[PDB]
Design a protein around this ligand. Sequence first.
Ligand code: A1AJ6
Lengths: 156, 39
Amino acid sequence: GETTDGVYRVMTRRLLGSTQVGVGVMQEGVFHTMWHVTKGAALRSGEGRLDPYWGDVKQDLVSYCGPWKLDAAWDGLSEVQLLAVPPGERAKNIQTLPGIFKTKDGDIGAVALDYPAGTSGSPILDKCGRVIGLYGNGVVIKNGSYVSAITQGKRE
Amino acid sequence: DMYIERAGDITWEKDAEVTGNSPRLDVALDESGDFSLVE
Ligand SMILES: CS(=O)(=O)NC1CCNCC1
């Protein structure tokens, strides 16, 4: 199928019509998305099949056709852009200054933007267009708003 | 049967819409990959 680098929608025809369950990134021949989008199932790209290669439920990440390739990191100072790909809508860039998730194992950037569930896997980018993580695994805070971690994998 | 469809290039947009706050939150991550607020 299509192997061109870029952002892609992840779709299913199991439910009513064609439903967008999430989003992912094609980079260096590997497809990257969040585990909760595919639950580790195989994917189709035209007539071709993409098989899972690595995944981790706790990180909530999965890669297809090869190992995780994305290794850019948020600098902790600058604004980033969410390249939101909402269901049935055009890809759109949203610029924001991340907040922080403080955990017992270290701090992670977080973006306070709220999109439909089928937007999970959309990439967060730095000013050079590098993917610093994927949007869609987060929490609901005091005022009821959604905040996503900037989730990044490890390039072995 | 899940399938993928290209939606665009990955590029920074000059003068994109700018929004969202920057909260600093104490959080916990469980074995199932769920984040929760520590209070
Ligand atoms: C998990 S998501 O980011 O794809 N969308 C949800 C965000 C929280 N409100 C409900 C939708």
